[PDB]
Amino acid sequence: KETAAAKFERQHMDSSTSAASSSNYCNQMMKSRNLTKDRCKPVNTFVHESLADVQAVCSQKNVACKNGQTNCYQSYSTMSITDCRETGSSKYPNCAYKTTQANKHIIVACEGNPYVPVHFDASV
């Protein structure tokens, strides 16, 4: 089975581009990363940074996660991100998203040895 760490990479990492380049970015990526296979996910975030830089967040500022757990970490620096949010015309299996570019700090939850991101909590 896919590990939580691998799922984080599949769901959230896109080191191949520096920012979303068109309005279709989210539609294409949500489909290509198999995030719409069983249902339309309502929201997602992609991070346009190296994997190493995102993994390093697990050694940065420890903060509470939104749900109160205490294994969350906030990046010291802002990162290039893309927000994807389902539009009103989305209807499974033709899931449809609005693409929004942003530059924000990320907050991730970390687990394991090596201690790596497993969940994307928030951008701030």
Q: In degrees to the nearest 10, what's the CA dihedral of 115, 118, 122, 124? A: 30
What's the rounded Cα separation, in Å, for the pair 97 and 87? Answer: 5
Residue of 13, 119, 121, 123 with catalytic role: 119
Q: Is 48 a catalytic residue?
A: no
Residue of 8, 12, 72, 108 with catalytic role: 12
Q: Is 105 a catalytic residue?
A: no
| 53 CB neighbour count, 10 Å cutoff | 13
> How many domains in the chain?
1
CATH number at residue 36: 3.10.130.10
What's the rounded Cα separation, in Å, for the pair 116 and 108? Answer: 9
41 by DSSP, 3-state: which? coil
Cβ-count burial of 120 within 10 angstroms (0-12 exposed, 13-18 middle, 19+ buried)? buried
Binding region for substrate:
7, 10, 41-45, 66, 85
The experimental resolution of this structure, in angstroms, equals: 1.1
What's the rounded Cα separation, in Å, for the pair 60 and 44? Answer: 23
Buried b (16+ CB within 10 A) or exposed e, 9-28: bebbbbeeeeebeeeebbbe
C-alpha closest to that of 57 among 77, 31, 86, 81: 77
Domain around 92: 1-124
